[PDB]
Design a protein around this ligand. Structure first.
Ligand SMILES: [Cl-]
Ligand SMILES: [Cl-]
Length: 162
């Protein structure tokens, strides 16, 4: 297991524009297009993202290309961020994947808001971080995903994904 396989499980793959859990236009492997209510705004972000006239449908190669870029962007946002970077550097390889997963889902600003959890993660107080991570809108809106990510921080193993 790795970050790519983890996120492919959490996000799924859809080749036509769909609404994510929050109701936003999305495509591929959780690639958010736009928060705007307009499917036309989505299709136009999609064409721009892919560089051709898609009519709301992309191929598997194209979905995987966006995914690679989004994982790369998630990692680069962690390393550019003064709150996230020291936490990431302190973690082992499996728990690093859990942090990336969270940033992918909710963005660098959102995760940087988990001030208390991040401090517990840095201190390696795994059971306490897991409890605090769960007291969140994130956990209450997407409990199955959040549980798998929290388990990963708690144990440092891929057990929630096998
Ligand atoms: Cl893009
Ligand atoms: Cl979920």
């Amino acid at each position: 297991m790795n970050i790519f396989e983890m996120l492919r499980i959490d996000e799924g793959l859809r080749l036509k524009i769909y609404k994510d859990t929050e109701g936003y236009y999305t495509i591929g492997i959780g690639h958010l297009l736009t928060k705007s209510p307009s499917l036309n705004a989505a299709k136009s972000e999609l064409d721009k993202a892919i560089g051709r006239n898609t009519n709301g449908v992309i191929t598997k190669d194209e979905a995987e290309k966006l995914f690679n870029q989004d994982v790369d962007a998630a990692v680069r946002g962690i390393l550019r961020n003064a709150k996230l970077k020291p936490v990431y550097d302190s973690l082992d390889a499996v728990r690093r994947a859990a942090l990336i997963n969270m940033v992918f889902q909710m963005g660098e600003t959102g995760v940087a808001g988990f001030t208390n959890s991040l401090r517990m993660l840095q201190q390696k107080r795994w059971d306490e971080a897991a409890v605090n991570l769960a007291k969140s809108r994130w956990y209450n809106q997407t409990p199955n995903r959040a549980k798998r990510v929290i388990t990963t921080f708690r144990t440092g193993t891929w057990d929630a994904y096998k």
